[PDB]
Amino acid sequence: QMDVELFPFGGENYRLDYKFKNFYNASYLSIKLNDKRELVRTEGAPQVNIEYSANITLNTADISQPFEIGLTRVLPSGSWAYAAAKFTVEEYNQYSFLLKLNKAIRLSRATELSPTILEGIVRSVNLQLDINTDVLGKVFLTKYY
């Protein structure tokens, strides 16, 4: 019923691209961050299949946890329609990214698993995205089952 996209520019400056798949004749559009801080407030009902854009800023305290960007359209009758998405922003050095991309390609070619399915094996072991002997023990149990 929508798709929302988050594109980065620099340290804190991000860009919020969104687009709605159905039309609700709303009074306004309130885009909030984890129900706490309001990012975007526009007037009138947004058009269907039109990609709108807005520049937002997120500090370090918002990136450290997977946050949620909620898009609610408030009708004149008082009721609303809520639609959200949960983002996860990771930050890597160019040397650190190419070494972790080296692990992700060589493990996916050997085990014939999808990189998203390999991400679920890593994330279930530890919080950080890294491969150790505990991850490789669960890649065996995944391929065996």
Partner: protein, 48 residues
Amino acid sequence: SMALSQQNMDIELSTLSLSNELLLESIKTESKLENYTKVMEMLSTFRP
């Protein structure tokens, strides 16, 4: 209002499902109801 996307061109779906949601949208705007459930509740008691 229809997007000219790759998903609208490849993904097969029922013609009868496309015809119902066109009829559900027209009834929802004339009676000025809340959703498609209130359309089905209105048809459950509509006599004539």
